């Protein structure tokens, strides 16, 4: 006798599977660093405002 046949199945290429599901962490760190200047430089200037003459 023959067992049940799952039929034709599509094996996802490792590259395609990674592109569809891989986690981005090093790009996430790099992105974050890239945004850091335009967001923080005004933030540091604002703290300079706090700390020179609002006390």
């Amino acid at each position: 006798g023959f067992t049940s046949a799952p039929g034709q199945g599509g094996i996802l290429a490792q590259r395609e599977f990674d592109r569809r599901f891989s986690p981005h962490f090093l790009d996430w760190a790099a992105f974050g660093v890239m945004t850091l200047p335009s967001i923080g430089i005004p933030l540091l200037l604002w703290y300079s405002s706090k700390r020179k003459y609002d006390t």
């Binding site: 945004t35 405002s49 003459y53 609002d54």
Partner: protein, 59 residues
């Protein structure tokens, strides 16, 4: 020419305390307003998967 000496007397009287938060009170408003607009972008990015570069002009 006198106005110089009256303003010298006035800012000497200020120098008695000389806190002068006038400008930076504003400067802090402007800078922290920039920060408050900036803070949503980083939270949005990871959760909404919105590339910073594509929306950088919009941001």
């Amino acid at each position: 020419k006198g106005g110089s000496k009256q303003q010298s007397e006035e800012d000497l009287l200020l120098q008695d305390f000389s806190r002068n938060l006038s400008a930076k009170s504003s400067a802090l408003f402007f800078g922290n307003a920039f920060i408050v607009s900036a803070i949503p972008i980083w939270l949005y990015w990871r959760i909404w998967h919105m590339d910073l570069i594509q929306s950088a002009v919009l941001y």
